[PDB]
Structure 1
Amino acid sequence: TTTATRLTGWGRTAPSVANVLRTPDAEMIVKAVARVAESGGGRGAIARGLGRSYGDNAQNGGGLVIDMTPLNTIHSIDADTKLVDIDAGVNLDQLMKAALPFGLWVPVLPGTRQVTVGGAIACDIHGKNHHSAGSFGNHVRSMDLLTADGEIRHLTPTGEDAELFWATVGGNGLTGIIMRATIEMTPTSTAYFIADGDVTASLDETIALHSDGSEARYTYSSAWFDAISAPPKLGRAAVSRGRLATVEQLPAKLRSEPLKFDRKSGTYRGKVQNLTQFYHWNRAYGPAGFLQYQFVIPTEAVDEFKKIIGVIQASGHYSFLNVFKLFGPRNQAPLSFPIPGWNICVDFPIKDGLGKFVSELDRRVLEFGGRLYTAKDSRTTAETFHAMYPRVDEWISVRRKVDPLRVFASDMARRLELL
């Protein structure tokens, strides 16, 4: 029933071997969890989606990994309530295609659409619209969680199991297997954005543009960011901002199928773009090529943020692929990554000294009240991680109640002592 398989995250690093269960039969999934539990726990089990997380949260060396991609049924779609009821293995591209004809839009879309609903919830993913829509967890209306007792429980964000619900959001699969969920989509009349572009010349200008109140005029905003140029050109950015377009805003040609599926001059106003145009290596060149690194610094620590940016460019580790964004308010999930503040993802070529240097970055992010993202990490320590997440003891306490025998476990769980 299972296949022994070498697994890595997307960055192709830190391999380990698991027995992988891959079945479309939910009852086989239920049985397998029971078998792990009735064996007393052992090396446990963890769900896996499309493996787009960069780190080691979707693998479990010497244990069971359940590939959830065969559970990919969209059970229902409701345009009045905006609710969509889908198996956890359905991916966002599939959901986007299925929901567009109903005038519904996936409420949080990350950099790639090849992620499962299960992985979207488990990592509480964020997108270009975080400051207006929060993260993926914000839009979960309910979910069915297969817990260690072999029971599938219906969780809601305000019901009696609210605590377990919010521990499951951002929980990295460690409260159990999400089987199915109900997502509240965002109403839309088109599959297009109307975008404004602006280019800044310095970190100070990038920061000023994000704090001048203009951000409140756009639902989506992010920026490509310069991390190599010495100051004052350090931190200059190419900012892409916009919102979903209405049909009347569409070019005449495009108005017939409005819900169709799919330096200096980078300044513009009212550009009409589809998803691909509006939104836009490690796998191709890994694990030898690149270390991805993502962090957020609280809004009020703006000078600490600039310092870290300064430290990065002076390091001699140079990243071209940089994404920057001002996060909005956080949600109630103890281990949710986003907090309001300055978010940046960088991508360092793997070079001598890199490891020691990012360990120093860790220290700075931590001291300044910031955090790393589990979906981008395969290397930090338990000590650093627990320190970045003041609600980790609270979260661990929920996990112990719902999984006393540690039926659910992963390489990440052991590394960061979340087990």
Structure 2
Amino acid sequence: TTATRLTGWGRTAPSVANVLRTPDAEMIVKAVARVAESGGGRGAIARGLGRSYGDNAQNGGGLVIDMTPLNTIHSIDADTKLVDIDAGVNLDQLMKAALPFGLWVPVLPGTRQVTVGGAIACDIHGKNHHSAGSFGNHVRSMDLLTADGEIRHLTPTGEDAELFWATVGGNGLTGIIMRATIEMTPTSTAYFIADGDVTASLDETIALHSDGSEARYTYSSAWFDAISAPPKLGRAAVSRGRLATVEQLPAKLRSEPLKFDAPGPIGELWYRKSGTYRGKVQNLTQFYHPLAYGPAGFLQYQFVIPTEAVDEFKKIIGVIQASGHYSFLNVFKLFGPRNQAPLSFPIPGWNICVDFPIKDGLGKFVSELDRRVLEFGGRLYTAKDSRTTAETFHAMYPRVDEWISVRRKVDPLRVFASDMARRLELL
């Protein structure tokens, strides 16, 4: 309907597309039919809230279907723990709606501004990955509008399970998720009980994550230093916890356990001695979400290295700090077991997101990082990428051919297409 210039969150690789934006599900069905009618052409991609940094929710010279008007919560059930929602409902909306039922969104990323469609398509992960897996693990069914114009009901097992698992992490390339049922996590409060620790070095950070203590916490992540020289390199502030029960709340908060409330060298000493603490009761915002639009001069880079390749992980961190590219915003987490989605990002291992200001030599440097990540058995995350190559990506994802095989069965005429799909030869 409306021609619009589109970028991801990273404000990079702009491309103009025809954007459809309607709450009418049948207009969406018809729009897809029109693309298949004179198709494939440049095809169509779904788009949620545009929070992926890269080019997966854009389609230069083709159609983009903005899914955010499709935002109905159909039902929430405390007995079965199931929510039935349109793919355009966002996680903030869902979190608020589900709390009074004693239910918790089972996987929450670092912003609540993502759609359910976006969460499935990038198979997102959170602080609780090591205990809960990623978003795809909790989908009980979804309705997918496929290239033929049919809406397929998909489930994680049984008939069409292959297509379900291709859609999880599928970056919108199997079709348009219209609706889904998610199994929620039961909770008696909206609060976490948290332990904080501060480490002096990378070795001590790795030791903390390898000593077995991760088994005591359902939620775990850390900020880490990627700028100091060794041994300060890789020191971290670690925050770990679990959902609080009602009696763990200060008496004052007990009447309303499920309410979500409204949002130098001296700096280091404070951050360090007070960064260590035990059994601190924290609301969702303080434990997780300190909370606009993201700046334009930064490259987001996220990769995971297999748990066993720990020496190799230490080497990549060393390479980063000696590069003359400086990142202050650095997340670190140890992932748990992967799921069965062929293109799912998380594997067990050392997960890092760094944020580099765009300077001369950055592009070629991150290409060298790609090489290292690949060599050591790791991979990068599509939701954060706009610049890796088809060659590197296919090698990072050993089940890519399996996934492409599914994609071609469900979309032979390439009705579904994006800038990422062409760049990474997934089309």
- For residues 285 and 254 of structure 1, the distance between their equivalents in structure 2, rounded to whole angstroms, comes to 33
SS in 1 for 2:237: strand
Aligned residue number for residue 3 of structure 1: 2
- For residues 370 and 270 of structure 1, the distance between their equivalents in structure 2, rounded to whole angstroms, comes to 34
- For residues 379 and 251 of structure 1, the distance between their equivalents in structure 2, rounded to whole angstroms, comes to 48
- For residues 201 and 423 of structure 2, the distance between their equivalents in structure 1, rounded to whole angstroms, comes to 38
Superposed CA offset, 1:134-175 (max 9, x none): 000000000000000000010000020100000000000000
SS in 1 for 2:64: strand
- For residues 287 and 407 of structure 1, the distance between their equivalents in structure 2, rounded to whole angstroms, comes to 33
- For residues 284 and 131 of structure 2, the distance between their equivalents in structure 1, rounded to whole angstroms, comes to 17
Superposed CA offset, 1:328-380 (max 9, x none): 00000000000000000000111111111000000000000000000000010
Give the stretch that moved more between structures: 350-359 or 87-96.
Answer: 350-359
- For residues 158 and 395 of structure 2, the distance between their equivalents in structure 1, rounded to whole angstroms, comes to 30
Pairwise CA distance, 1:289: 1.7
Q: Which runs of 4+ in 1 moved over 6 A?
A: 284-287
Give the stretch that moved more between structures: 121-130 or 256-265.
Answer: 256-265
Aligned CA distance change for structure 1 residues 285 and 5 (closer, same or farther; 3 Å) = closer
Pairwise CA distance, 1:40: 2.4
Tell me the TM-score normalized by structure 1: 0.98
- For residues 251 and 288 of structure 1, the distance between their equivalents in structure 2, rounded to whole angstroms, comes to 42
Give the stretch that moved more between structures: 271-280 or 82-91.
Answer: 271-280
Give the stretch that moved more between structures: 324-333 or 32-41.
Answer: 32-41
SS in 1 for 2:109: coil
Aligned residue number for residue 256 of structure 2: 257
- For residues 180 and 158 of structure 2, the distance between their equivalents in structure 1, rounded to whole angstroms, comes to 15
Aligned residue number for residue 340 of structure 1: 348
- For residues 73 and 336 of structure 1, the distance between their equivalents in structure 2, rounded to whole angstroms, comes to 27
The answer (yes or no) to whether the contact 1:294–1:376 under 8 Å persists in 2 is yes
Q: Does 1:276 align with 2:285?
A: yes
Pairwise CA distance, 1:265: 2.4
Pairwise CA distance, 1:24: 0.2
Pairwise CA distance, 1:38: 1.0
Q: Percent identity?
A: 100
SS in 2 for 1:5: strand
Aligned residue number for residue 60 of structure 1: 59
The answer (yes or no) to whether the contact 1:228–1:318 under 8 Å persists in 2 is yes
SS in 2 for 1:6: strand
SS in 1 for 2:273: coil
- For residues 259 and 159 of structure 1, the distance between their equivalents in structure 2, rounded to whole angstroms, comes to 36
- For residues 24 and 273 of structure 2, the distance between their equivalents in structure 1, rounded to whole angstroms, comes to 55
Superposed CA offset, 1:291-319 (max 9, x none): 11000000000000000000000001010
Aligned CA distance change for structure 1 residues 142 and 299 (closer, same or farther; 3 Å) = same
- For residues 161 and 184 of structure 2, the distance between their equivalents in structure 1, rounded to whole angstroms, comes to 21
The answer (yes or no) to whether the contact 2:260–2:283 under 8 Å persists in 1 is no
The answer (yes or no) to whether the contact 1:322–1:344 under 8 Å persists in 2 is yes
The answer (yes or no) to whether the contact 1:143–1:155 under 8 Å persists in 2 is yes
Superposed CA offset, 1:158-210 (max 9, x none): 02010000000000000000000000000000000000000000000000000
- For residues 407 and 214 of structure 1, the distance between their equivalents in structure 2, rounded to whole angstroms, comes to 48
Superposed CA offset, 1:87-130 (max 9, x none): 00000000000000000000000000000000000000000000
Pairwise CA distance, 1:261: 1.9
SS in 1 for 2:313: helix
The answer (yes or no) to whether the contact 2:309–2:376 under 8 Å persists in 1 is yes
Alignment of 1:5-404 (within 5 A): 5-262=4-261, 263-280=272-289, 288-404=296-412
Pairwise CA distance, 1:15: 0.3
SS in 2 for 1:356: helix
SS in 2 for 1:89: coil
Pairwise CA distance, 1:286: 6.4
Pairwise CA distance, 1:288: 4.4
SS in 2 for 1:24: coil
Aligned CA distance change for structure 1 residues 53 and 250 (closer, same or farther; 3 Å) = same
Aligned CA distance change for structure 1 residues 357 and 285 (closer, same or farther; 3 Å) = farther
Superposed CA offset, 1:257-282 (max 9, x none): 000024232000000001110015xx
- For residues 110 and 386 of structure 2, the distance between their equivalents in structure 1, rounded to whole angstroms, comes to 19
- For residues 38 and 289 of structure 1, the distance between their equivalents in structure 2, rounded to whole angstroms, comes to 40
The answer (yes or no) to whether the contact 1:13–1:286 under 8 Å persists in 2 is no
Superposed CA offset, 1:213-253 (max 9, x none): 00000000000000000000000000000000000000000
- For residues 287 and 265 of structure 1, the distance between their equivalents in structure 2, rounded to whole angstroms, comes to 31
SS in 2 for 1:285: coil
- For residues 40 and 206 of structure 1, the distance between their equivalents in structure 2, rounded to whole angstroms, comes to 52
The answer (yes or no) to whether the contact 1:220–1:243 under 8 Å persists in 2 is yes
- For residues 412 and 243 of structure 1, the distance between their equivalents in structure 2, rounded to whole angstroms, comes to 36
Structure 2 residue ranges without an equivalent (≥5) = 262-271
The answer (yes or no) to whether the contact 1:170–1:337 under 8 Å persists in 2 is yes
Structure 1 residue ranges without an equivalent (≥5) = none
Q: Does 1:407 align with 2:395?
A: no
Pairwise CA distance, 1:61: 0.3
Aligned CA distance change for structure 1 residues 286 and 272 (closer, same or farther; 3 Å) = closer
Superposed CA offset, 1:49-89 (max 9, x none): 00000000000000000000000000010111100000000
- For residues 39 and 323 of structure 2, the distance between their equivalents in structure 1, rounded to whole angstroms, comes to 48
Superposed CA offset, 1:7-64 (max 9, x none): 0000110000000000000000000001100112111000000000000000000000
Aligned CA distance change for structure 1 residues 302 and 182 (closer, same or farther; 3 Å) = same
Pairwise CA distance, 1:287: 6.3
